[PDB]
């Protein structure tokens, strides 16, 4: 742990200098912009100075974009591995040599230094023995740029770090330019430097035309990620704590309410819908911190206070009273459910549907330890006093949880609220969690009124058939969040199918006559058993399917973003729950359990049915898949089949790479963008054929008088504005 990390924490502003000479001609550019390290991202605009530029921008981009090292997102486990941050207030020499195939070469000469708020890298360029009919100066160069990773070792000779990387250039023509970078970084302080072991930085760019700017220039949006080494297995001690804490008050919140399960209910609804929505819109500026402290603190009073309404007699002594608690139950809960959400999936970074399975497990055990309170509790004192007891093990988590929880701190986002709910995504989402809720709670006012006039049965006898519910809700949480973390393009599928389910069991819950379906009690212990499967199914990868909806929307990543996501977990929860069971007494006084069954089942059929067409019209993803290659003998001919969705391929290009086992992934054919032009590797030319169907959006390669030396997994590129290959198939010629 550098000095320098402290120093990084938020978005500090960049400026850039470069003076350059390419065979006899100087040129010189420079700009500004603002780059973060909390988690990685760098944006770069680029002005030229002299008015033309002899060169391509992407040239360039490896000095300019490349050049700032420190804006680096490292991960928890390699903050020792991190030598740009190490001395980085005395600033550092990137002195590199650029060397491209069969054109000039380039020597760079950066110094980096921080100046205020304001870091400032002067470079200066040496071009040599470019051709005038090459790619270079001919300026058969696309306007893209691809993603990179770039290797790091250490050096303790100069105490600095040595690199060794090979970029990629996207031809016009189709083919592909190959430029191998060695840089030297040297520190200029006097203070201790961190000498690094081996590790990775991927790179992944995105360039840009300001729309207004007339003189020649370049918006570079840069985002970079570090690895390299294994991670041990081992969790943190920020992971063990948070989880430990997480599972402990959802467990006392299941057990104080095992015990105690028309205009209250309209004033409860309304300010639980309150209290989560303002509450978690404000979760940057008050404190996560103080919010997980906030709101077992509260309720654990409402486990002290319900014990002391015994006391007064009815009237304005105990109704006014009941007014008072709860507003601390629904705010309290209210309070930790969003808090508990917000401090989880930041410990939890690429784990999130996978941890709510556990802690919502956890709380399945609650109601388990329901006759436990009827064990020695109930038997002592009855039901004056056993509610102040188990209320200091509750307010005993205090010092501990005070004391286990981190600290975090993020600056309050500027998107409004709102936008979030203005998506179509988001609208039909809510639909789901306000349908899937109201299915829930119809059944606990209306299941025992069905069994009392039908079977008969003593309501005690009921409560045994809410545990053959949550039997099953315990089990299916953690393995639907098992399989909703490692497929996320399954989690859409996951979700609707869990619905519709949950229409079909509800339809024969309470059969119709139509139906002419005899009930008895083994039928609903069964029918009843696979709504637990259905309900687990759908309730646990709908917050990480909000949370994948807003990134992809052009929200940050963080505290920020989290808390407002998670602040309508809790709200469109409660919008079930009002016009579930007060619109579910209206219904029951229509005609009976026999259609209240049914007609509240269409409403989640009709749930399903309507995000369920919205996202299979219109999905749209880039993914390319490869299929065909086997086992074919030396002389024969193949063919290849690239398949491309999310995009057209009429007007981008494709190319195609091969890997030999062992060996550096190499470059077969391209096509260009007009198809027209096109270009193959110079061992293979004239026995391979490109080909396509623009309209059928496929490419095809055709493969003459096959070697043993072309057996290789082939794959297949495109560029979008960020680059994406294909899956890749194994050629093998024996």
């Known amino acids: 742990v550098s000095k320098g990390e402290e120093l990084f924490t938020g978005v500090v502003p960049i400026l850039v200098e470069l003076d350059g000479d390419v065979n006899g001609h100087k040129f010189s550019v420079s700009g500004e912009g603002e780059g973060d390290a909390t988690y990685g991202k760098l944006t770069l605009k680029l002005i030229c100075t002299t008015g033309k530029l002899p060169v391509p921008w992407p040239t360039l981009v490896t000095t300019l974009g490349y050049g700032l090292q420190c804006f680096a997102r490292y991960p928890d486990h390699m903050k020792q591995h991190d030598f740009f941050k190490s001395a980085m207030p005395e600033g550092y020499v990137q002195e590199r040599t650029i060397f491209f195939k069969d054109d000039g070469n380039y020597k760079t000469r950066a110094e980096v230094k921080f100046e205020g708020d304001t870091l400032v890298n002067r470079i200066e360029l040496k071009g040599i023995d470019f051709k005038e009919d090459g790619n270079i100066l001919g300026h058969k160069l696309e306007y893209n740029y691809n993603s990179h990773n770039v290797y790091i070792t250490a050096d303790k000779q100069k105490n600095g770090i040595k690199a060794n990387f090979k970029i990629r250039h996207n031809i016009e023509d189709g083919g592909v330019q190959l430029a191998d970078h060695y840089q030297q970084n040297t520190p200029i302080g006097d203070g201790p430097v961190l000498l690094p072991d081996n590790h990775y930085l991927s790179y992944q760019s995105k360039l840009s035309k300001d729309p207004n700017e007339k003189r020649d220039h370049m918006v570079l949006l840069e985002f970079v990620t570090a690895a390299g080494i294994t991670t041990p297995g081992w969790l943190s001690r920020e992971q063990v704590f948070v989880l430990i804490s997480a599972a402990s008050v959802n467990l006392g919140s299941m057990m104080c309410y095992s015990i105690l399960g028309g205009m209250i209910f309209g004033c409860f609804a309304l300010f639980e819908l309150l209290a989560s929505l303002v509450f978690g819109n404000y979760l940057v500026h008050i404190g996560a911190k103080f919010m997980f402290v906030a709101g077992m603190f509260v309720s654990g009073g409402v486990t002290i206070l319900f014990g002391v309404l015994d006391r007064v007699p009815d009237g304005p002594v105990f109704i006014a009273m009941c007014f008072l608690v709860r507003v601390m139950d629904a705010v309290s809960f209210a309070a930790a459910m969003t808090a508990s959400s917000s401090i989880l999936a930041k410990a939890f970074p690429n784990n999130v549907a996978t941890v709510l399975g556990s802690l919502e497990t956890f709380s399945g055990l609650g109601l388990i330890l329901g006759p436990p309170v009827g064990g020695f509790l109930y038997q002592s004192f009855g039901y004056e006093v056993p509610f102040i007891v188990l209320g200091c093990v509750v307010l005993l988590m205090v010092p501990l949880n005070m004391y286990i929880l981190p600290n975090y701190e993020s600056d309050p986002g500027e998107h409004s609220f709102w936008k979030l709910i203005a998506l179509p995504k988001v609208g039909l989402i809510a639909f789901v969690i306000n349908s899937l809720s109201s299915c829930f709670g119809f059944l606990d006012p209306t299941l025992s009124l069905f069994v009392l006039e039908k079977f008969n049965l003593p309501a005690g006898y009921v409560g045994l058939v809410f545990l053959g519910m949550a039997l099953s809700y315990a089990i299916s949480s953690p393995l639907f969040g098992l399989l909703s973390d490692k497929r996320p393009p399954l989690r859409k599928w996951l979700l609707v199918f869990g619905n519709l389910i949950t229409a079909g069991c509800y339809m024969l819950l309470g059969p119709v006559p139509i139906l002419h379906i005899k009930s008895q009690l083994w039928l609903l212990v069964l029918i009843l058993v696979v709504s637990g499967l259905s309900a687990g199914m759908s309730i646990i990868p709908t917050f990480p399917e909000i949370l994948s909806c807003a990134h992809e929307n052009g929200f940050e990543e963080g505290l920020s973003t989290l808390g407002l996501v998670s602040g309508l977990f809790s709200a469109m929860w409660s919008i079930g729950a009002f016009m579930g069971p007060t619109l579910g007494g209206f219904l029951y006084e229509k005609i009976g359990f026999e259609w209240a069954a049914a007609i509240q089942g269409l409403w989640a059929l009709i749930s399903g049915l309507a995000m369920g067409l919205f996202y299979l019209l219109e999905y749209s993803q880039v993914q390319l898949v490869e299929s065909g290659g086997a086992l074919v003998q030396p002389g024969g001919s193949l063919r290849l089949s690239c398949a491309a969705s999310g995009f057209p391929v009429n007007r981008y290009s494709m190319r195609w790479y091969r890997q030999a086992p062992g060996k550096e992934r190499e470059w077969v054919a391209g096509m260009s963008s007009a198809g027209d032009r096109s270009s193959y590797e110079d061992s293979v030319k004239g026995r391979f054929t490109i080909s396509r169907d623009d309209a059928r959006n496929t490419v095809y390669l055709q493969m003459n008088s096959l070697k043993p030396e072309d057996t290789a997994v082939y794959y297949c590129?495109?560029?979008?504005?960020?680059?994406?290959w294909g899956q890749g198939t194994q050629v093998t010629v024996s």
């Open positions: 590129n495109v560029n979008v504005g960020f680059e994406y």
